[PDB]
Design a binder for this molecule. Sequence first.
Ligand SMILES: *[C@@H]1O[C@H](CO)[C@@H](O)[C@H](O)[C@H]1NC(C)=O
Ligand SMILES: *[C@@H]1O[C@H](CO)[C@@H](O)[C@H](O)[C@H]1NC(C)=O
Ligand SMILES: *[C@@H]1O[C@H](CO)[C@@H](O)[C@H](O)[C@H]1NC(C)=O
Lengths: 49, 49
Amino acid sequence: KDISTVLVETNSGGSVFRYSYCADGFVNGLQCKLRLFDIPPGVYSNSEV
Amino acid sequence: APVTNERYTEMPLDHQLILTEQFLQTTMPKFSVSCETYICDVSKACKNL
Ligand SMILES: *[C@@H]1O[C@H](CO)[C@@H](O)[C@H](O)[C@H]1NC(C)=O
Ligand SMILES: *[C@@H]1O[C@H](CO)[C@@H](O)[C@H](O)[C@H]1NC(C)=O
Ligand SMILES: *[C@@H]1O[C@H](CO)[C@@H](O)[C@H](O)[C@H]1NC(C)=O
C-alpha cells in the first residue's frame, strides 16, 4: 500500500541477511533511528513522532 | 621584596576591601539535533535526496 523505511544488515559479501521494518513495533522504531540492530541499554535522545 | 641593607621602604598605612567579581562562562545547554528532520520536514522527497 505505502512506503517503508526498513533497516538492513549486510554480511561480508554485501548480501542482506537481517532486517526490521520500522512500523512493526516500537523498539524497531529506534532501531531505525540509530542504525544499530541489537541496541545496548542506555538513554537515547531526540526520537521523533 | 626581601629587605636587606636598610633603606627607606614605604609601607602602607591602611588597606581597603575591593570586590573583583569575575564571571567565567562554564555551561551551555547540551543539544541533540536531528538534521534529517531539521533540513527537511515530514516530506520524504528530501530524505531520499
Ligand atoms: C565482515 O565481518 C566479519 C566479522 O568479523 C569478518 O569475518 C569479515 O571478514 C568481514 N568482511 C569483510 C569484507 O571484511
Ligand atoms: C651592607 O653591605 C652592602 C654591600 O657591602 C652595602 O651596600 C650596604 O650599605 C650595607 N648596609 C649598611 C646598612 O651599611
Ligand atoms: C584608604 O582606604 C580607607 C579604607 O577604605 C579609607 O578610610 C581612606 O579614606 C582611604 N584613603 C584615601 C586617601 O582615600
